[PDB]
């Protein structure tokens, strides 16, 4: 599962459509990551701190392609939201990691996201979640764009909306 498209085509409308495919689950997320890194990406794993997906990370995401992925709250009366880390291996032997955090209760919490390059093949897990959420200055899902250099000749530019029906759009480009 998990579709790929031309990166040039990635945008808010495309991700809204992804979002809408999932239906009115109370908390969910549509994730688009645009690979303009100059390298081929290959899926490693997704670490869900909470929530799940019915789909699989697109296995291969070439330079020039964006991946569309999604996540949703666990079924039933569960209020831990959809919080996770996506990990792709890049053809230079390093890892691109993406954090998403979509809480249940917006009267307490907010959406957050982050992006980071790790040296080597590093699977998403709890230590990476904690680093990206608590240590590495994540960006608020505040309906605004945020840019930052990643090192390693790359940078990120991304956008996350503010709500429980979440949209996360990230572009990883050469710096």
UniProtKB/Swiss-Prot annotation:
Compartment(s) where it occurs, according to its Swiss-Prot or TrEMBL record: Secreted; Nematocyst; Target cell membrane
Note whether Ion transport occurs among the keywords: yes
User: In chain numbering, where does the site feature Protrudes from one subunit (B) and inserts into the hydrophobic cavity from the adjacent subunit (A) fall?
Assistant: 56
UniProt lists the family membership as follows: Belongs to the actinoporin family. Sea anemone subfamily.
Q: Which GO terms describe its molecular function?
A: channel activity; identical protein binding; lipid binding; toxin activity
| Misc note | This protein has been found to bind carbohydrates, since it shows a substantial delay in elution profile in size-exclusion chromatography. The carbohydrate pocket ovelaps with the lipid-binding module of actinoporins.
UniProt site (Part of the hydrophobic cavity (in subunit A) that receives Val-60 from the adjacent subunit (B)): 12, 145, 159
Gene Ontology biological process terms, A to Z:
cytolysis in another organism; monoatomic cation transport; pore complex assembly
The protein depicted here goes by the name: DELTA-actitoxin-Afr1a
Please give the subunit comment from the record: Octamer or nonamer in membranes. Monomer in the soluble state.
Outline what the protein does. Answer: Pore-forming toxin (PFT) that consists of a crown-shaped octamer or nonamer that forms cation-selective hydrophilic pores of about 1.5 nm (inside) and 13 nm (outside). It causes cardiac stimulation and cytolysis (EC(50)=1.6 nM on erythrocytes). Interestingly, the Phe-12 is crucial for hemolysis.
Q: Where is this region: Trp-rich region, which is important for the binding to lipid membrane?
A: 101-116
What do the Gene Ontology cellular component annotations say?
extracellular region; nematocyst; other organism cell membrane; pore complex
Q: Where is this region: N-terminal alpha-helix that contributes to the pore?
A: 1-25
């Amino acid at each position: 599962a998990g579709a790929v498209i031309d990166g040039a085509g990635l945008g808010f409308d495309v991700l809204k459509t992804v979002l809408e495919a999932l239906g009115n689950v109370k908390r969910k997320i549509a994730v688009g990551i645009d690979n303009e890194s100059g390298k081929t990406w290959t899926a490693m794993n997704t670490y869900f701190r909470s929530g799940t997906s019915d789909i699989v990370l697109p296995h291969k995401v070439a330079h020039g392609k964006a991946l569309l992925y999604n996540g949703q709250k666990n079924r039933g009366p569960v209020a831990t939201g959809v919080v996770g880390v996506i990990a792709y291996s890049m053809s230079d032997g390093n890892t691109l990691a993406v954090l998403f955090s979509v809480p249940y209760d917006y009267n307490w919490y907010s959406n957050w996201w982050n992006v980071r390059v790790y040296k080597g093949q590093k699977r998403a897990d709890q230590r990476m979640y904690e680093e990206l959420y608590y240590h590495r200055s994540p960006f608020r899902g505040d309906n605004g764009w945020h840019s930052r250099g990643l090192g390693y000749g790359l940078k990120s530019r991304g956008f996350m909306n503010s709500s429980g029906h979440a949209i996360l759009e990230i572009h990883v480009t050469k710096a």
